[PDB]
Amino acid sequence: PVLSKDVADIESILALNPRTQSHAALHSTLAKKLDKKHWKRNPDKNCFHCEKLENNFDDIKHTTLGERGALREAMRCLKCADAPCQKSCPTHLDIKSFITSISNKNYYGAAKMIFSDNPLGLTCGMVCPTSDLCVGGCNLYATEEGSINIGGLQQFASEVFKAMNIPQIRNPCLPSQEKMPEAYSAKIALLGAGPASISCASFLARLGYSDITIFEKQEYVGGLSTSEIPQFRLPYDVVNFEIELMKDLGVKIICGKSLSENEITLNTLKEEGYKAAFIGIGLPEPKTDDIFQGLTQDQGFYTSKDFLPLVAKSSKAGMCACHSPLPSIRGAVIVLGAGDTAFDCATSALRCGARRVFLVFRKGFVNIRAVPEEVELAKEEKCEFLPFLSPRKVIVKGGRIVAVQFVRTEQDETGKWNEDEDQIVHLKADVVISAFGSVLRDPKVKEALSPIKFNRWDLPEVDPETMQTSEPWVFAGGDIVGMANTTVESVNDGKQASWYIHKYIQAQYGASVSAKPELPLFYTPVDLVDISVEMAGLKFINPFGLASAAPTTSSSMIRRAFEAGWGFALTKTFSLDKDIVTNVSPRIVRGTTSGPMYGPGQSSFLNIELISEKTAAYWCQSVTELKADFPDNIVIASIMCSYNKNDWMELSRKAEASGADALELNLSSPHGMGLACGQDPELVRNICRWVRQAVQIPFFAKLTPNVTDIVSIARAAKEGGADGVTATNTVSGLMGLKADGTPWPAVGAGKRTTYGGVSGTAIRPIALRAVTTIARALPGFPILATGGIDSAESGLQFLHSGASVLQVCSAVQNQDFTVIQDYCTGLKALLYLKSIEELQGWDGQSPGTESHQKGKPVPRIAELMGKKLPNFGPYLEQRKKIIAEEKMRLKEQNAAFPPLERKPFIPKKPIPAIKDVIGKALQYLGTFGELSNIEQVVAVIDEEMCINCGKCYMTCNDSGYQAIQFDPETHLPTVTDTCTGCTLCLSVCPIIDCIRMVSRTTPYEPKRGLP
Amino acid sequence: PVLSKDVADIESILALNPRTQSHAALHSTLAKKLDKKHWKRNPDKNCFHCEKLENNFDDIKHTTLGERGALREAMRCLKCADAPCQKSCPTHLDIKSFITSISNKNYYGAAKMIFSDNPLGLTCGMVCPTSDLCVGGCNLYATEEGSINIGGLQQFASEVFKAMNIPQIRNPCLPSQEKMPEAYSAKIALLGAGPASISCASFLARLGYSDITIFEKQEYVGGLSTSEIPQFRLPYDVVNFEIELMKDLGVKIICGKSLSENEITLNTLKEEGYKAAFIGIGLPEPKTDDIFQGLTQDQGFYTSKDFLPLVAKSSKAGMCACHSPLPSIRGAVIVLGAGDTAFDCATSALRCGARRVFLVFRKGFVNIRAVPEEVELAKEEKCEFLPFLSPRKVIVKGGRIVAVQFVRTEQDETGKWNEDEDQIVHLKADVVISAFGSVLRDPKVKEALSPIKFNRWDLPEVDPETMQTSEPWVFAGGDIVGMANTTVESVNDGKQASWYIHKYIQAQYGASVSAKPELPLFYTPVDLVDISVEMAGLKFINPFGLASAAPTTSSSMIRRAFEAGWGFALTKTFSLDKDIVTNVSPRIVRGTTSGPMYGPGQSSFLNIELISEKTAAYWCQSVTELKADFPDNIVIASIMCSYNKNDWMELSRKAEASGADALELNLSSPHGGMGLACGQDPELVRNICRWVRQAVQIPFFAKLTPNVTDIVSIARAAKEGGADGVTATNTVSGLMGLKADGTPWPAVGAGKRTTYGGVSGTAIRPIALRAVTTIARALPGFPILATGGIDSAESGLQFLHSGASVLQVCSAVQNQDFTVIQDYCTGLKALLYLKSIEELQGWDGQSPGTESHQKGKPVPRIAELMGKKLPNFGPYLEQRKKIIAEEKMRLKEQNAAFPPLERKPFIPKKPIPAIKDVIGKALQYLGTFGELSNIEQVVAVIDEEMCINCGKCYMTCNDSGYQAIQFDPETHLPTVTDTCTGCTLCLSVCPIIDCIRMVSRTTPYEPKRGL
Ligand SMILES: Cc1c[nH]c(=O)[nH]c1=O
Ligand SMILES: Cc1c[nH]c(=O)[nH]c1=O
Ligand code: SF4
């Protein structure tokens, strides 16, 4: 037969494989109109019908992210200096840092940074109106692809931390409880268990106060996060999670107790010995209108304070003891108002069975208070909008509402608003929900706050800097003060008050506090993990250090790196005066190793830099100064001489005398098998011998990867007396040419260049091979790793490969010295998680991937699965039909009485130290002959995760075994039995873990070419 | 002094540098509220107040892209199989292919693909309602980051092509015009010079028809693209560009005669000897309403058909000889309707000076059918929206409209719309514009179409597949047929018609046409460029070939690659029967070299694959069949033996006898400072080449490994042994990474074992490029076949410039499919063609010089706007808007300047370089470090108008450089100071291409010695 020709059944497999076209394509406009419907993904502008949402409380947030989407967006963030997003965040979250942590896969460190400044970090990630806050200042708004999804990233990192089930711990910088001064036992009262008081109590507990009580009127906690924000924006289990974190700090909550004249008052708190009080009761009553006087819910009238708590109580499992039904909202619903509550009333009314929802407001579209995020949810769910209408009267017939009369409004010459009595609208309605806002009106509650001063907005008056009322022991914040318009601002109000409550209480006990307010961070048991390591008789407080490179150009830079937390640092390589050099410019350029992607996260750099231009006297004086000031931080002096015994001996002794803990020998010098000393084992052995005879401190040989066998050079260094090797220096390369042939870097008028050194993540596979091969050949010989280390996650790969410490250059060039805090918290988390048996199915900090579309979990419904319903076109309609019917079956098949007491996971094995993980990977490395060819695998695709791109199919067709069927109608792939398990399809799929490799169960025959 | 500390002025420079935080930050809610306005980038929700737009016709499209943004978005596209976006494009554009070309920087190839199926490809890129077309089907809608900006990408590639100023050429597949059959001289008439006729005439001219005339009623051409679509969405020079492309094919346009009685009729056309006619006159008249009878423009009334051409004539330079005054539209403007025209009237009215615009429509918001893109523009410019109002009276006093009276509208149960006479609105207004649609209604125009059949909507009937009317020689398309609602569907109507006009005319002359419609592609002189090359006596039709790898697993795949256009291919390496191998699985994994980015454009792969599992008998028979079927495509047999003379001679003779054009010796076989493999030892390579040279007479090439100290010594030994060239290079040995539990990937068997693998792809391109350059400089003229990260025409040309003659590809096909060859070939043709064009020297290949821009739109060149430290946020942005608006007004009150350049194509001034002409031309720039000038230093300089204020340059200079950048605390604008050393890190990390540039240093230079 013709061996080079596909047989008919493979030709059939290949039907949808791309082919080069020779002509333009003929398709009529009518046929194109009909075919469009089959592939449609987004909403249809001609669709006017609301799709059925009765009893559907699934997440509708557009900002929710899964891990795949979160990694992409975190990598996109510029991680800006003095970032304007943080300036625009009311709690001043270090967004730069927590997004950096997410991009490095350090979800713990991200969450810790979030909760350090915002104890309701998950709630806020979900509900913050970011377009009017952090995102509104994001620099990437100045790009076509637009601003960063900061809230979704905050939500993702916080959701992972939640799933870790790690508790908050008492501030570890505090003295033991025993030894705390008496002032910290002062009895503190907080009124209302909403965002403001939860924040305030949390920060007070961080400061060490041990007697903190929140008194809550209702039987549920969380405030408006619980009672009014819909479950389809903020799941109730988020609120519970954040309350439990605060309770870890000892805060007490007592429900069923009210600030009111016949219960708790300021006077009764004083009588009972309370020393300070925080008022955080919000705005508990609806703003009402005479037009609705006497109307009952049974007639069809609600305020938002009546309606939204009913929906919350029904839809939020564990909010109440009583299971309760969803309000029977049938027919046409009129929502009055255009604030943000109005849009939650409209979307919630659809969940209660509304046939039609009209949002009617008394000003125009350009006057809507609502953030666009909030408006869009109502728009996409087909609520109707009626502007310029002021309500005049509700029509009641047969005991129920049947219509609302309105008068038109308009804006005149001044700008101020008139009503037009002659221009009426009679709007039919079965239900009316007023969303006019909220107030504090209850005279009993107001009198319980005697004698604090109220302002003309009729709210407690506070100093906006201290949150103190006119009574010095009473503070207030959140909605009740009338500035905060958001959860995060109410959180910040409690945070602000906490410092000044602390100051007031301390002064009452005769103690002063710092002139600069200084609140503690958020802490968990992860932060107590020991990440120190000893290597070559040297103690490293953590394994991360600055490589000898541009980040160590000046010793003042090393000083700042030590102040940031870096465990050790190399000097830039320096030499004797005779060997003075002069750099050229340009000399450091970005890598082209991952295409025309600019900005953060360059996959490599190339440099034609020389050794340090600063003198040996500068570096030796600097080493003395750094070791004087930072005795616990390791300083390694990097030195270079030509192939001359007397020179190496003189320079090494000079660096030793300066106080260096160790030396690093840079073997890049040309000599008299490559042109460099480091490429010849005999020269390396001699250089190490000369230094070993000259000094008594340890020294390490820095190996080049540009050699046939780096184990040869490493053994030469050991034979010469080196105490270890640094693996590796940069890979020799040329990073590319402009289209006119000239290079980059191009030096001088001649536009000349020379071969440079490639650094960064593009050389990590080369460095990782070098470290592992040296570690297997020379067991126990200390290795300092360098080559693309840019995270705790990747640092741990080099530790597992045999290195003891981790040098970094390019990751700092891509960012700044503060990445050390990400690396340290990330490594602590990785080691801590190894002790948690309940998380053993995770890959480091990553939860096992389950079925999702757009990071939202696929509903596991019998009638959604197995049956070839992709997420587009008519298949998507059928999917939505199936989900809707199952929500209705869910409305009766009704349960909410098996929640889950949230108890943290406890380590059930010792937490490994660094020395316990070094080299653990080497057991899996060997020769090719040690790999099983009997245990073969095949690919299997999770159809529910697939996004129908066909990349697996095209890679198997033109780089594989033509083993994947690609359906022409559903665009769903299926791996057939001809799969060889090569794993290319998995490697190109855009969805993490959509494709998995599983043990082959059918007989396996290698394809030998037989007909 | 303390050398390791920053002096005072450096400490202040470092003021905004990121530092690690040990405490939570205290910032009051009130202070946060006041600071938020300073940084604000996006629209303020509280802004009731549209900024001023009078006489401002600058681009407002949200989809416009510059090069930086286009490359990012094109790399994001999954480049899907059987792509649904193409299914959803009415002209069936190969979106996958043209976006692939953009990602590979081949803007010519992308434009050629666009214009092959859409002769108005630039217009459609700007105006297509993609959310209802191609983008509505995009698979990436199923990700959080969302669908691809297809239209903006189409616009960008077409804009670059426009700037190339290259003409369209006659279809080069046609015989010369002297020897075309008589039928192609048939006189063809088209009526109306809009998108439908322009498309129809273009495709007819592509087919070879030489007598094609478009008869246009007006003095201007382009149809609605000219007369009504606003300049701030579609610049007139786009329309002119596409018209001139069509005139390149010989289509004639005659303005001033109409299809109408007493003018042109179907009867006059027939009598004058026209053989076919296409009706593309659109809907030339406004849909009227009796309530507007007698109202005049002087009173303030317009239909859309009166208003929008008035604005076009004034704002589009080159439409008229008349410098037209913009309609003075002061006061309140009421636009009636909510179709897409209504929104263009609203935005255009602002440009005329309207103070407020109301969009008033008779149904609800759910019932608006305008695409969301178009609604968003009116919404963001603060137009008001009034639903459920039907106009009843226009009130005129003092000779001017002063108000419009409406009645409320309402739906029933039946869904039947009613008007409530008792519910009235009296809206004050100075101008009324009706946007009720367009119609064909002039009795003499319809009478000129006698006797074709019209339908119940008074439109000509066509067969929807052929576009033929009831008269066989008359065809129709576009708006006039009533099916197209878009420019692209109108283009498609003309495209569809062109084939059946062709079929009809050919039949009239007694000739048949193929049953499969075959419209020709779009061609330019670039497509005639020769990209063949000769090497080692072998003739390659193009320099691109498949490497010996997974894309050549089977000879059936090589066959399909040749059919796609690949110039050559390697077999997978094969061996004698006794050397049979068995692969393990998994064995090919994605690279980790550019972080957790999944899907397209993987920056590397790692493989632990062996040689072919298929027999030498399979491969030799396959080579015979491939060479019999594709004699002009080069087939190179890759072979491997152990270090054995008899084996190498036997296998190489077997492959030679099969008809292989050449052999490639895989030097990966183990044997025994010269490692394990034969390719790492020059003595072994020399002997192997000696053996093969004795055995065969065809050329052979030694495939070098990069895993060697000195690859030149290996290449020299191969040449001494008799090889005719070398292939540089094989994969780089590496370990791609470990999971957090220490297990490797790939992991084989239950033991999860691995071995060192080979790294391929763009991550190893700097290594391969250094290898090719160093061999080319040491062994000038010795043929080099390059392999290692070649993924585009421009990377291919880097390797040619470096001394290679042909270009092997693997990973780029694994990342995609075989059809990338068409991108590579057109891209290489374009790169060589542009080298002959003097007017484009300043480009870098296909990339224009970057002008100052924000979000890809050029910054206004205004004096008071330059150098005034006004970044694009907060109060500075408001000042920029004032300055821009002010001299839009000064450009108004002086109404001169109507000189739109007449478009002439650039002409090559020297011959087009052939492949052999460019080989090695980069080597002149390579040298030793000592040959680099250290006198000619550079410094960095920042273009503040392109800056997006991220501080990355600042952060990198601070912690990886010389603390030489000032970063302003209020404007977040950086300035390079005189302590710059030209190191070039800041440029290397800046997210904006060419925002930072290196320039010659003009101030005295001293190296920093620290001392
Ligand atoms: C001195 C030096 C400069 N650049 C590098 O990449 N490595 C080195 O050792
Ligand atoms: C046989 C072979 C497999 N994989 C590679 O990367 N190179 C080779 O030569
Ligand atoms: S022509 Fe229009 S519909 Fe087709 S791909 Fe381009 S933008 Fe999309």
Q: Where are the domains of chain A?
A: 1-24+927-1011, 25-181, 182-285+439-530, 286-438, 531-837
Helices and strands, counts by H and E, chain A: 30, 35
Distance, CA of A771 to CA of A556 (rounded, Å):
31
Smallest CA–CA distance from B753 into chain A, residue: A924
Interface of B with A in 52-91 (CB under 8 A): 64-66, 68-69, 71-73, 75, 78-82, 84, 87-90
* DSSP conformation letters of B677-694: BGGG-HHHHHHHHHHHHH
Q: Provide the β-strand partners of residue A995.
A: A941
3-state secondary structure of A856: strand
Method in brief: X-ray
3-state secondary structure of B216: strand
For residue A870, how far is its CA from the centre of ligand 3 (angstroms)? 24
Q: What distance lies between CA A601 and its chain's CA centroid?
A: 16
B749 token code pair? 């068997």
Q: Which of B205, B196, B112, B212 is nearest to B157 (CA)?
A: B112
Q: B800: Cβ–Cβ under 8 A, 6 or more apart, which residues?
A: B543, B807, B915, B918, B919
Q: Which atom of ligand 3 is nearest to the CA of B125?
A: 7
Q: A365: Cβ–Cβ under 8 A, 6 or more apart, which residues?
A: A385, A387, B379, B384, B385
B514 touches chain A (CB under 8 A): no
* DSSP conformation letters of B433-448: EE---EE---HHHHHT
B473: phi then psi, degrees, rounded to nearest 5: -90, 0
Is A573 touching ligand 1 by the criterion CB < 6 Å? yes
Is B611 touching ligand 2 by the criterion CB < 6 Å? yes
Distance, CA of B977 to CA of A641 (rounded, Å):
34
Q: Which of A696, A691, A635 is nearest to A666 (CA)?
A: A691
3-state secondary structure of A204: helix
User: Cβ distance B606 to A765 under 8 Å?
Assistant: yes
User: Cβ distance B581 to A27 under 8 Å?
Assistant: no
Q: Provide the β-strand partners of residue B700.
A: B663
The beta strand positions in B788-839, using DSSP E, are: 806-809
Q: Are strands A438-439 and A285-286 parallel, antiparallel or unpaired?
A: antiparallel
A122: phi then psi, degrees, rounded to nearest 5: -75, -45
User: Cβ distance B998 to B984 under 8 Å?
Assistant: yes
Query: With contacts defined as CB-CB under 8 Å, which chain B residues touch A152?
Result: 144
Smallest CA–CA distance from B988 into chain A, residue: A590
Measure in Å the smallest separation between the Cα of A131 and chain B Cα atoms: 8
Distance, CA of B547 to CA of B808 (rounded, Å):
5
B37 touches chain A (CB under 8 A): no
Q: Do B770 and A613 touch (CB under 8 A)?
A: no
Q: Counting beta carbons within 10 angstroms of the beta carbon of residue A262, is it exposed (0 to 12), middle (13 to 18) or buried (19 or more)?
A: exposed
Query: To which H or E segment does residue A334 belong?
Result: strand A331-336
The beta strand positions in B222-292, using DSSP E, are: 252-255, 276-279, 285-286
The beta strand positions in B719-797, using DSSP E, are: 725-728, 732-734, 757-760, 784-787
> Which letter does DSSP use for residue A700 in this model?
E
Q: Counting beta carbons within 10 angstroms of the beta carbon of residue A264, is it exposed (0 to 12), middle (13 to 18) or buried (19 or more)?
A: buried
CA angle A281, A285, A291 (to 5 degrees): 165
- Ligand nearest the Cα atom of residue B118: 3
Whole-angstrom CA distances from B641 to A188, B140, B609, B651 are 84, 47, 17, 8
Distance, CA of B643 to CA of B653 (rounded, Å):
16
Q: Which of B447, B467, B473 is nearest to B458 (CA)?
A: B447
Distance, CA of A16 to CA of B84 (rounded, Å):
12
3-state secondary structure of A174: coil
Q: Counting beta carbons within 10 angstroms of the beta carbon of residue B697, is it exposed (0 to 12), middle (13 to 18) or buried (19 or more)?
A: exposed
Q: Provide the β-strand partners of residue A427.
A: A404
3-state secondary structure of A434: strand
* DSSP conformation letters of A503-535: HHHHHHTT----SS--B-----GGGG----EEE
Q: Which residues of B546-556 are buried (b: 16+ CB within 10 A; e: fewer)?
A: bbbbbbbbbbb
Distance, CA of B606 to CA of B609 (rounded, Å):
9
Nearest to B998 among A586, A610, A816 (CB): A586
Q: Are strands A699-703 and A724-727 parallel, antiparallel or unpaired?
A: parallel
B555 token code pair? 């000879």
Nearest to B81 among A625, A932, A950 (CB): A950
Q: Do B370 and A45 touch (CB under 8 A)?
A: yes
User: Cβ distance A585 to B998 under 8 Å?
Assistant: yes
User: Cβ distance B153 to B100 under 8 Å?
Assistant: no
User: Cβ distance B915 to B531 under 8 Å?
Assistant: yes
Distance, CA of A342 to CA of A363 (rounded, Å):
14
Rg (chain A; Cα; Å) = 34
Q: Which of B113, B177, B92 is nearest to B527 (CA)?
A: B113
Nearest to A765 among B22, B608, B759 (CB): B759
First to last CA, chain B: 10
Whole-angstrom CA distances from B275 to B474, B498, B505, B518 are 9, 14, 7, 21
Distance, CA of B976 to CA of B959 (rounded, Å):
15
Q: Which amino acid is at B801?
A: H
Is B604 touching ligand 2 by the criterion CB < 6 Å? no
A504 token code pair? 């007031």
> Which letter does DSSP use for residue A421 in this model?
E
Evaluated on CA atoms B294, B300, B304, B310, the torsion sign reads positive
Distance, CA of B102 to CA of B116 (rounded, Å):
16
B854 C-beta neighbours (distance < 10 Å), count? 17
The packing angle between helices A487-508 and B29-39, to 10°, is 140
User: Cβ distance A530 to A523 under 8 Å?
Assistant: no
Nearest to A954 among B66, B732, B816 (CB): B816
CA dihedral B26, B28, B33, B34 (to 10 degrees): -90
Cis peptide before A372 (omega within 30 of 0): no
Distance, CA of A1002 to CA of A757 (rounded, Å):
49
Q: Provide the β-strand partners of residue B808.
A: B545, B787
Distance, CA of B498 to CA of B519 (rounded, Å):
8
Q: Do B384 and A366 touch (CB under 8 A)?
A: yes
Q: A574: Cβ–Cβ under 8 A, 6 or more apart, which residues?
A: A611, A612, A614, A615, A616, A618, A619, A637, A638, A639, A640
Distance, CA of B696 to CA of B655 (rounded, Å):
9
* DSSP conformation letters of A470-504: SSTTEEE-GGGGT---SHHHHHHHHHHHHHHHHHH
User: Cβ distance A931 to B44 under 8 Å?
Assistant: no
User: Cβ distance B222 to B197 under 8 Å?
Assistant: no
Evaluated on CA atoms A336, A342, A343, A347, the torsion sign reads negative
Q: Which residues line ligand 3 (CB under 6 A)?
A: B 89, 91, 93, 95, 118, 124-125, 128, 130, 133-134, 150-151, 154, 488
Query: With contacts defined as CB-CB under 8 Å, which chain A residues touch B367?
Result: 48
Q: Are strands B806-809 and B662-666 parallel, antiparallel or unpaired?
A: unpaired
User: Cβ distance B769 to B803 under 8 Å?
Assistant: no
Whole-angstrom CA distances from A376 to A340, A373, A379, A813, B380 are 11, 5, 5, 41, 14
Contacts of residues B689-694 at CB distance under 8 Å and 24 or more positions apart, as own/partner, are B689/B665, B689/B717, B689/B718, B689/B720, B689/B721, B689/B722, B689/B723, B690/B721, B690/B722, B691/B645, B691/B648, B691/B649, B692/B648, B692/B649, B692/B652, B692/B663, B692/B665, B692/B722, B692/B723, B693/B721, B693/B722, B693/B723, B694/B649
User: Cβ distance A438 to A285 under 8 Å?
Assistant: yes
Instruction: Name the residue with the closest Cα to ligand 3, atom 7.
Output: B151
Q: B644: Cβ–Cβ under 8 A, 6 or more apart, which residues?
A: none
Q: Which atom of ligand 3 is nearest to the CA of B154?
A: 6
Q: B915: Cβ–Cβ under 8 A, 6 or more apart, which residues?
A: B531, B532, B533, B543, B800, B805, B832
User: Cβ distance A277 to A497 under 8 Å?
Assistant: no
User: Cβ distance B491 to B120 under 8 Å?
Assistant: yes
Give the count of alpha carbons within 13 A of B980, CB side only.
33
Phi and psi based region of residue A508 (left: phi greater than 0; alpha: psi -120 to 50; beta: remaining): alpha
B26 token code pair? 């205290």
Give the count of alpha carbons within 13 A of B308, CB side only.
28
User: Cβ distance A214 to A251 under 8 Å?
Assistant: yes
Distance, CA of B732 to CA of A758 (rounded, Å):
14
Distance, CA of A624 to CA of A627 (rounded, Å):
5
CA dihedral A450, A456, A462, A465 (to 10 degrees): 180
Helices and strands, counts by H and E, chain B: 30, 35
Is B661 touching ligand 2 by the criterion CB < 6 Å? no
Q: A610: Cβ–Cβ under 8 A, 6 or more apart, which residues?
A: A581, A582, A583, B929
Q: Which of A542, A987, A282 is nearest to B602 (CA)?
A: A987
> Which letter does DSSP use for residue A798 in this model?
H
Query: To which H or E segment does residue B203 belong?
Result: helix B195-206
Q: Which atom of ligand 1 is nearest to the CA of A573?
A: 1
Rg (chain B; Cα; Å) = 34
Q: Which of A219, A189, A190, A192 is nearest to A284 (CA)?
A: A192
The packing angle between helices A95-103 and A150-164, to 10°, is 60
Q: What distance lies between CA B804 and its chain's CA centroid?
A: 29
The beta strand positions in A591-693, using DSSP E, are: 605-607, 634-639, 662-666
CA angle A844, A847, A849 (to 5 degrees): 125
A985 token code pair? 């399809």
Distance, CA of A126 to CA of A114 (rounded, Å):
13
Q: What distance lies between CA A736 and its chain's CA centroid?
A: 35
Breaks in chain A (C to N > 2.5 A) come right after 672
A30 touches chain B (CB under 8 A): yes
Q: Do A984 and B814 touch (CB under 8 A)?
A: yes
Q: Are strands B732-734 and B757-760 parallel, antiparallel or unpaired?
A: antiparallel
Q: Which amino acid is at B377?
A: L
- By 3-state DSSP, what share of chain B in percent is helix, strand and coil, each rounded to 5? 35, 15, 45
Distance, CA of B247 to CA of A999 (rounded, Å):
63
Q: B578: Cβ–Cβ under 8 A, 6 or more apart, which residues?
A: none
CA angle B636, B641, B644 (to 5 degrees): 130
Distance, CA of A725 to CA of A709 (rounded, Å):
14
Measure in Å the smallest separation between the Cα of A323 and chain B Cα atoms: 35
Alpha helices in A390-474 (DSSP H): 443-448
B1011 token code pair? 């001392």
B710 token code pair? 């000195």
User: Cβ distance A535 to A724 under 8 Å?
Assistant: yes
A615 touches chain B (CB under 8 A): yes
Nearest to A816 among B82, B551, B959 (CB): B959
Q: How many residues does chain B have?
A: 1011
Distance, CA of B747 to CA of B430 (rounded, Å):
76
User: Cβ distance B1000 to B935 under 8 Å?
Assistant: no
For residue A527, how far is its CA from the centre of ligand 2 (angstroms)? 46
Interface of B with A in 528-587 (CB under 8 A): 549-551, 553-561, 563-565, 582-587
